[PDB]
Motif scaffolding. Structure first.
Motif, PDB file in Angstrom:
ATOM      1  N   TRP A 153       0.465   5.771   0.085  1.00  0.00           N
ATOM      2  CA  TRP A 153      -0.407   6.926   0.264  1.00  0.00           C
ATOM      3  C   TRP A 153       0.380   8.149   0.731  1.00  0.00           C
ATOM      4  N   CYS A 185       1.655  11.031   2.866  1.00  0.00           N
ATOM      5  CA  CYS A 185       1.718  11.194   4.313  1.00  0.00           C
ATOM      6  C   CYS A 185       2.634  12.344   4.716  1.00  0.00           C
ATOM      7  N   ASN A 234       0.824  -1.205   0.000  1.00  0.00           N
ATOM      8  CA  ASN A 234       0.000   0.000   0.000  1.00  0.00           C
ATOM      9  C   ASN A 234       0.861   1.260   0.000  1.00  0.00           C
TER      10      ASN A 234
END
Ligand code: 3HD
Length: 27
Positions: A22, A24, A20
């Motif tokens: 993403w 941040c 995963n």
């Protein structure tokens, strides 16, 4: 095979270490 809380990438994105990714700021 192991997974961590949050893995930083390019000093901007994070990863679950399991596949995963993403945006941040820093877990
Ligand atoms: C999860 O733990 C693993 C322990 O062997 C380590 O090899 C892996 O390195 C990406 C990750 O820290």
């Amino acid at each position: 095979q192991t997974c961590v809380s949050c893995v930083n990438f390019g000093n901007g994105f994070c990863g679950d270490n399991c596949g995963n990714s993403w945006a941040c700021s820093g877990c």
